[PDB]
Design a protein around this ligand. Structure first.
Ligand SMILES: Cc1cc(C(C)(C)C)c(O)c(C(C)(C)C)c1
Length: 133
């Protein structure tokens, strides 16, 4: 089910990340560093617990969760949100809610690449990752 997402992924393309960050109210100086950062995402499992790590020269984050069970999350931009990750049509869908707002982080595998689509408001960012050996 989740197994083809597991591993180490490196950012190879990004579209509209600044628009997504702006929509969330991230400050200009943080957007500016983040626009030049190429993070590594690591996805691991131990039983039914998934861990997702995002490593970079700027910010590092790590979450652990069970699919389909809500968890509290503090995001890289310091939002305190209620999160849930599920599997929907073969995609890993991460929904964050806070203050009546929502954002989705959808991960799909196409041609061996991991495509992350981030939506908040009208902003839609697409980030492409390639799997490390
Ligand atoms: C500012 C900022 C915001 C985010 C999200 C909003 C995607 C959570 C982020 O992922 C990053 C790194 C890519 C650097 C981890 C920086």
């Amino acid at each position: 089910m989740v197994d083809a997402f597991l591993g180490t992924w490196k950012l190879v393309d990004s579209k509209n990340f600044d628009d997504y960050m702006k929509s969330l109210g991230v400050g200009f100086a943080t957007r500016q560093v983040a626009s030049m950062t190429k993070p590594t995402t690591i996805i691991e499992k131990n039983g039914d617990i998934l861990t997702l790590k995002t490593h970079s020269t700027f910010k590092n984050t790590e979450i652990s969760f069970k699919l389909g069970v809500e968890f509290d999350e503090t995001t890289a931009d310091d939002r305190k949100v209620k999160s849930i990750v599920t599997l929907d049509g073969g995609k890993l869908v991460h929904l964050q809610k806070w203050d009546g707002q929502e954002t989705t982080l959808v991960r799909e595998l196409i041609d061996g690449k991991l495509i992350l689509t981030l939506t908040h408001g009208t902003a839609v960012c697409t980030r492409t990752y390639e799997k490390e050996a």
